[PDB]
Amino acid sequence: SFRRFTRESLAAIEKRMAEKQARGSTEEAPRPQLDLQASKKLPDLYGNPPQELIGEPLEDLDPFYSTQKTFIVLNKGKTIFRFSATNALYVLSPFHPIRRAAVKILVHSLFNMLIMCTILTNCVFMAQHDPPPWTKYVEYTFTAIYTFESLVKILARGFCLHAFTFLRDPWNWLDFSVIIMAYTTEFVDLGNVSALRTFRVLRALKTISVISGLKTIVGALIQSVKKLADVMVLTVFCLSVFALIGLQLFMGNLRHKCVRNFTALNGTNGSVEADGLVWESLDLYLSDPENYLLKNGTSDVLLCGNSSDAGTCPEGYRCLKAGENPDHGYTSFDSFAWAFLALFRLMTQDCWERLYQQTLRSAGKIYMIFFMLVIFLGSFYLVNLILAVVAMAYEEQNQATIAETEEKEKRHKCPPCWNRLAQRYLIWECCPLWMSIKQGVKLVVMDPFTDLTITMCIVLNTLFMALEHYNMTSEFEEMLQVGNLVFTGIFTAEMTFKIIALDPYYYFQQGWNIFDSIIVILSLMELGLSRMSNLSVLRSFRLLRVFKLAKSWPTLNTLIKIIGNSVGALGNLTLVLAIIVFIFAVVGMQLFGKNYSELRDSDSGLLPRWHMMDFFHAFLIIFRILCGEWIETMWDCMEVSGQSLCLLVFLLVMVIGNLVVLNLFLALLLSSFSKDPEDCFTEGCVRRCPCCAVDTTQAPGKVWWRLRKTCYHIVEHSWFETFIIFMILLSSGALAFEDIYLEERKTIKVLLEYADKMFTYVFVLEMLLKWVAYGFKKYFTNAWCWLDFLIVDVSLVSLVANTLGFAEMGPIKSLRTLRALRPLRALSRFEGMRVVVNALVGAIPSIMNVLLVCLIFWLIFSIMGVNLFAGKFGRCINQTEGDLPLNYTIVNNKSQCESLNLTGELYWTKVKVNFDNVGAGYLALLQVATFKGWMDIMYAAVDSRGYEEQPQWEYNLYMYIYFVIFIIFGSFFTLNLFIGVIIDNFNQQKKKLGGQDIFMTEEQKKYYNAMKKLGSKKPQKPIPRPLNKYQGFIFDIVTKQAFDVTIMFLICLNMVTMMVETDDQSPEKINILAKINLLFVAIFTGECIVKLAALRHYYFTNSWNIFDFVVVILSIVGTVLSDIIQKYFFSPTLFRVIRLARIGRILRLIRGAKGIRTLLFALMMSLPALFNIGLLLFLVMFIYSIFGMANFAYVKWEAGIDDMFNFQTFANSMLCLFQITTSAGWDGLLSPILNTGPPYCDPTLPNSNGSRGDCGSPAVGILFFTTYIIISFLIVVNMYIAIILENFSVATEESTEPLSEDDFDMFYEIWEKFDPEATQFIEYSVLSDFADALSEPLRIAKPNQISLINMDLPMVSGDRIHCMDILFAFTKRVLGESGEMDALKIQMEEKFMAA
C-alpha cells in the first residue's frame, strides 16, 4: 500500500459512501467476506513479512462489505486489529498523534503481558480472610492500572459515537463496571447494607483475555444448551408427576414416633399423670423431647408403624403422630416443594438409603415397589437422555469444525549459534588411540538377548518393595537394603555401559535415555542422604521404574497418550475448569464466612468439620460437591445463613461443574479414539477297536440301533422339555424355606428332604438317558453340558456321603452349602439370557487387558499409602463411654494406657479398615474410589500422629492432597480407558455379525421391524349432515384451535387445583377443593359427551380417542361413586389408592407435545433390550441371596444391620441386595461381619441351631461383596450402552415413500389426448418425435427413451410397445412393489387387462 497515510487517500471513498442510498446503488449473500478477522495470522495474499511496516495504519485491503472507514493494523505477530475512523468531536482527528500513540500501544503485545502480570497477583490478595490493615493502599495501585487500559482503548475507537466503538464488543463493557466501583467507594458514604464487596471477585473472568482459545472454547461450551431442548421439559414433567404420586401416599408419615405410656385425667381438669409427675395438657406432653425414645447405637429418633409389616418399639411405649420432622425438618412429604426436593435428591443418587429405610419403616415393606419404579425411570433413563444429547451435539460440532478446514484446504531455530564448534570436540569421542573395548561393548549390548534380562530385574524389584508391613525384625530391613543396593548397582552399570556403547551425541534421541538419566541420578542422590537425620519418605520417586515397561506393553501406551492429551492438546478446558472452581470457592467463602462461629459452643474450641472459614476448606467443599455429595453440607447451611441463598448457589455450582466435567470427559474420549445318530466319536482310537461297525442283521446289531432311535425320538418331544423345566423351577424355588424358623416347623423337614432325594434321582436318570442317546459328543464337546455334569457330580458325592452315614466327618458339610448353584441350570433353556451371556463372554480378553494395568496403577498407590500410613491408627478407649478416643493429655501411647489399665476398663483398638499391608491398602483404595465410607478413612488419616501414638484433633491437615490426587487420577482416566475399550469391542462385534443387533432374538427381531414401520395418515370427513344449521354453528368451533386452547387451559387449572394439599387443615379448605374437583369432573364429562353424533361410530381409530375415554371418565366416576358412599370410611390405605387414579388426567397433554412423543417412542423401542438384562440381574440376585442366607444368620446387630434389614429371612435379604445393587452403601453391612474380638463377640452363645459364636469370618465376606459389586457394574454398563445406542439410532427420519396417489394424472391426460382406454400402444419411431415437450419432469431424455425398447417389455403384434408394462416399470422405479395408492393404479390396469 503506502508507508504512511495521506489526507486525500480516503476522500475518494468518502465522497461516494454517503451517496450509496441514491447514486451508489441506483444478490446480497451476507458472508464473512473471505475470512480476514482479528486475532489471526492468515497468510493468504503475500505470505512474506514486511521489512519495517509494523505499527502503522493500512489502506484496508478488504471487500467493501467490511471496509467503510475502518483500517487494519498489524503487529510483529501480524495480528489484524480493526479500527473505524470517524470524527470524535472536539478538535480530535483520525490523523493526529494522540491517536497514533494509542494505536501503537494497543497493537503491541508488551502491555498485554502487563495485564497478565496484574490480575493473577490480585487473585492472591483476594484469597485472604483477615487482610492486614495496610493492604488498602495496595488496592489503589491496582485501580491505577486498570483504568489505564480502558483509556487507551477509547483513544483508538471512540466511546459510543458512530460504530466499531469500545462498547460494541460483548466482552468489553464487563470491565466498565469494574471501573465504576474502583472510583465509587472511595468518595461515597457506603450504604447501610454491607457484604456487597464480594462483587470484586468477578474480574477473574478477565482471564479470558489470555488467548483466543479461551474465547472459542467458551463459545463451544455455550453452543450446546440451545441444542439441549425439551429434555429438561420431559425431566420436569416426570419429576412433577412422581412428586404428585408421592405426596398422595406418604403424607404426614414422617412424624410417627412412640412416647412413654399415658394415663387418664384421674379427675380434675387438664392434668395428665405419669410416674408421679403431672403435665398441664396434651400439647405440652407430646412436645417435650424427654418423652421420646432413641434408636440404639445412634443419636436419632425411632419411628413406628401401625401396619402389620412396619415394626414397633418395646413394651411401655405407644406410637403416635407428634413432634418435628427428621433431619431438622428439611426432608418430608407434607407439601409440594419438599416432595420435589426429595425426588430431585432421589434422582441424583445422594444419600437415599436413609430416606429409603425411613419410609419403609414408617409406611410398610410392601411400599418398596414404589422405589423400584422410580430408579429405573429416574436414575438411568433421564441421565442417559442428557448424555446422548450432549454427545450428539459435541460430535456434530467437531464434524463441522473438521469439515470447515477440509473444505478450506481443497477449494531460524538456532538463537545462540555458538555450540556448533563444540561439536568438533564431540561425536569423535573414540579419540585417535585405538581400542577394541568399544567393539566388545557394542557387540554385547544386543537387543533380543540382554534387554529381556533387564526386564526381569525390574519386575522383582517391584515385588521386593511390596514386602512392607507391620511388626518386622531386623532381618527384613537387612534384606530390603541389600536388594535395593543390588538393583541400583545393576541399573548404574547398565547406564555406564550403554553410554559407552552408543556415542553421547546419539544418546538423546527419544528422551527415554533422559528419563533413565534422571531416575538414576535421583536414586543415587536419595541413596546418599542416608544418615541419622534427613530421613523422610525415601520411596521418593523410585516407584517410577514401574512405568519402564512401556516398551514391552502396548496397552499402557494408551494410558500414556491419554495423560499426555490431558495437557497441551486439550490443555484449555482444564484451565477453564480450574478457573471456575477457583471463582466458586472464593465467592462461597466471601458470602458465608462469618456465619460459622456459633456452631462450636462446646469443648472450648471444637470446630465442626467441613466449614467455610478459610480458602482450603472452601476448596474441599467445592471438590466434594463436584464428586456428588452435597445434601449434608446444605443441611449444615440453611440454619446459620438463610434458606434462599444456599439452595441457589449449590444448584448453580452443581449444574455448571457437572456440565464442564462431562464435556471434558467426552472430548478426552474422542481424542483417545483418534438317519442314524453319531455312534461314539470321530476316527480316533478306532484303530484299536473297530468294534462298532458290526453285523447289523442279527439281534445284537439291531438292538442298539432300535434303542438309539428310541432315545432320539424320546429326547425330541416338547413334553419332556416342559417337564424338565418345571422340575428345575421347583428345585430352584424349594430352597427359600431354609431360614432360622425351620427347626420349629417339624412337618416341613421331612418333605424337604424327600424332595431333595427325588430331585437328584430324576436328574441322574435324565443325564444317563441323554448320555446313551447322543453319544460321547456332548458333555465333552458342547459347552453347556459340562455345567450340568459338574452340578450332578456335586450332588452325587453329597448323596453318597449322606447315604453311607459318614456325614459327620466335617468338611463334608461344606458341600452342603454349595447347593446354591442349583438355580444355574436355567441359563440355557429359555432363549432369553443365552444371547446376553454370549455377548458378555465374547469380551473377556479386553476386560483382562484393562484389569492388569488397573491393578498395577493401584499397586503403586497402595505401596505409597502403606509407607505413609503404617501403624498410625491405634487408640485406646473407655468401654463404658463408648468408642471415642479420650485425649492426648493423660494417655499418649500404648504403654501409658496399658499401665493405666488397672481396673479393666481401657481397651486398645484399631480401625476396621487400615493400611497395615498391601491387601488392606487394596481394600481401602476400593472403598475410596467408590465414594462409600471414605469419610472414616480420611478422618483417621488427618488425625494421625507419630508411631503408635494417640491421635490429636487435626494435627496433620495437609494429607487431603493424596486423596485428591488419587481421585483425580485413578478414578477418571481408568474409567475413560475402560469405556473406550468396551465401546470399541462392542462396535467391532456389531460390525462382525452384520446389520443386526446383538441383544435381540428372532421373535424380537420380527416385532422390532414390524412396529418400526411409520406413516399412517387418514384425515377423512365421515360427518353426516342431518341439518347444516345446528351442527354447523358448533363444528366450526370444534375445528379451530380455540377448542384445544381451552382444553389445555382446563388441564392447567386442574393441575393448579391439585397443586395445593398439605396436612390436616380446617374444613373450609376441604369443601372448596371438593367443589372445584366436582366442577372439573362435570366439565370433562360434558366434553366427552360432545362427541355425540359428531363422528358417529367412525371415530374408533388409532387416534387418542379411547385413551382419554377409558382413563378419564371411567376412573373419575368410579372414584366419585367410591366417595359418595357417605356411610362409613374404613381402611384409608384402601381409600387413597382409589383417588390415586385422578392423576391419569394430567397425562393427556403429551398428545400435543413436540418431542416427548419421540422420546416415549425411544422408550418403546428400547424395552425389549432391557427385558433380558433384567431377567439375568434377577437371577444373579436370587443366587447370591440364597448363598448369603446361610452364613450371616446370627451376626450381631450393629451399624448398618437392624431388625428390619438383615439376612434372617428371604424378604429382608432381598431388600438388602436391592439396596446394595447400586453400590448405595455397603460399608455399614461389611463392618458388623468383620469383627472377631471377645470385646465385641461371645464365642459361647446359646444359639438355637447347632452353631457357636456371634460373628462370621471376613475372609468370605470380602469376596462376597467384591464379586457382587463387580458383576453389578458390568451389567449396568451393558444396560447403559444399549440405551444410548438405541437413543442415538432412533434420531432419524429418512423417507417411507408415502406419496403415490398423484401419479396417474399424466397418463390420464395422455389417454384423453389420444385414446381414453388405458390400453393403447406406442412406437419408438413416433415416440422420438412426440415425446419432446412434457411438463412435470418425471420423464427422461430422448436418447434414454430409446433404451427402453428392451427394458421389461413384452413383444406382441408387429413389434408394438405395451403401455401398461411401461406404466408398471415406471411406478416400480420408485416404490412399485408394495403400497396402497399405486396398488389402485395397478389393479385398474389389471382389470382393464381382463376385458
Ligand SMILES: CC(C)CCC[C@@H](C)[C@H]1CC[C@H]2[C@@H]3CC=C4C[C@@H](OC(=O)CCC(=O)O)CC[C@]4(C)[C@H]3CC[C@]12C
Ligand atoms: C491463578 C488461579 C488459577 C489459582 C490461584 C490460587 C493460588 C495462586 C493461591 C490460592 C491460595 C493462595 C495462598 C493463600 C495463603 C497463603 C499464605 C500466605 O502466608 C501466610 O502463611 C499468611 C498467614 C495468615 O494467613 O495469617 C502466603 C501466600 C499463600 C501461600 C497463598 C499463595 C497463593 C495461593 C496458593
Ligand SMILES: CC(C)CCC[C@@H](C)[C@H]1CC[C@H]2[C@@H]3CC=C4C[C@@H](OC(=O)CCC(=O)O)CC[C@]4(C)[C@H]3CC[C@]12C
Ligand atoms: C454484572 C453484569 C454486567 C454481567 C453481564 C455479563 C454479560 C453481559 C456478558 C458476560 C459474558 C458474555 C458472553 C461471552 C461470550 C459470548 C460468545 C460470543 O460468540 C460469538 O461471538 C459468536 C456469535 C454469536 O454468538 O452470535 C457471543 C457473545 C457472548 C455470548 C457474550 C455475551 C455477553 C455476556 C453474556
Ligand SMILES: CC(C)CCC[C@@H](C)[C@H]1CC[C@H]2[C@@H]3CC=C4C[C@@H](OC(=O)CCC(=O)O)CC[C@]4(C)[C@H]3CC[C@]12C
Ligand atoms: C457475584 C454475585 C453477583 C453473586 C450473588 C450475590 C448477591 C445475589 C447476594 C450477595 C449479598 C446478598 C444480600 C445480603 C443480605 C440481604 C438482606 C436480607 O434481608 C434483609 O435484611 C432485608 C432488609 C431490607 O430489605 O431492607 C435480604 C436479602 C439480601 C438483600 C441479600 C440479597 C442477595 C445478595 C445481594
Ligand SMILES: CC(C)CCC[C@@H](C)[C@H]1CC[C@H]2[C@@H]3CC=C4C[C@@H](OC(=O)CCC(=O)O)CC[C@]4(C)[C@H]3CC[C@]12C
Ligand atoms: C517430577 C519428576 C520427578 C518426574 C516427571 C518429570 C517430567 C516433567 C519430565 C521429566 C523427563 C521429561 C521427558 C524427557 C524427554 C522427552 C522427549 C521429548 O521428545 C521430543 O521433544 C520429540 C518428540 C518426538 O519424538 O516426536 C518429548 C518430551 C519428553 C518425553 C519429556 C516429557 C516430560 C518429562 C517426563
Ligand SMILES: CC(C)CCC[C@@H](C)[C@H]1CC[C@H]2[C@@H]3CC=C4C[C@@H](OC(=O)CCC(=O)O)CC[C@]4(C)[C@H]3CC[C@]12C
Ligand atoms: C496440590 C493441590 C491439589 C492443592 C490445592 C490447593 C492449593 C492451591 C492451596 C490451598 C491451600 C494452600 C496451602 C495453605 C498453607 C500452606 C502452609 C505453608 O506450608 C507449610 O507450612 C509446610 C507444608 C507444605 O508446604 O506442604 C505454605 C504452603 C501451604 C501448604 C499452601 C500450599 C498451597 C495450598 C495447598
Ligand SMILES: CC(C)CCC[C@@H](C)[C@H]1CC[C@H]2[C@@H]3CC=C4C[C@@H](OC(=O)CCC(=O)O)CC[C@]4(C)[C@H]3CC[C@]12C
Ligand atoms: C507423585 C505420586 C507418586 C504420589 C503423590 C503423593 C503426594 C500427594 C504426597 C507425597 C508426599 C506428601 C507430603 C509428605 C509430607 C508432608 C509434611 C506434612 O507436615 C506435617 O505433618 C506438619 C505437622 C507438624 O509436624 O507439626 C504435611 C503433609 C505433607 C506436605 C505431604 C503432602 C502430600 C504429599 C506431597
Ligand SMILES: *[C@@H]1O[C@H](CO)[C@@H](O[C@@H]2O[C@H](CO)[C@@H](O)[C@H](O)[C@H]2NC(C)=O)[C@H](O)[C@H]1NC(C)=O
Ligand atoms: C471410664 O469410665 C468410667 C465410667 O464412666 C469412669 O468411672 C467413673 O469415675 C469413677 C472412677 O474414675 C467411678 O467410681 C465412677 O462410678 C464412674 N462414673 C462417674 C459418673 O464418676 C472412669 O473414670 C473412666 N476412665 C477410666 C480411665 O477408667
Ligand SMILES: *[C@@H]1O[C@H](CO)[C@@H](O)[C@H](O)[C@H]1NC(C)=O
Ligand atoms: C379448668 O381449670 C382451670 C384452673 O382451675 C379453671 O380456671 C378453668 O375454668 C377450668 N375449665 C373448665 C372447668 O372448663
Ligand SMILES: *[C@@H]1O[C@H](CO)[C@@H](O)[C@H](O)[C@H]1NC(C)=O
Ligand atoms: C438396643 O436396641 C435394640 C433395637 O432392637 C434392642 O434389640 C436391644 O435389646 C437394645 N439393647 C439393650 C441392651 O437392651
Ligand SMILES: *[C@@H]1O[C@H](CO)[C@@H](O)[C@H](O)[C@H]1NC(C)=O
Ligand atoms: C402401655 O400402653 C399400651 C397401649 O396399647 C398397652 O398395651 C400396655 O399394656 C401399657 N403398658 C403399661 C405398663 O401400662
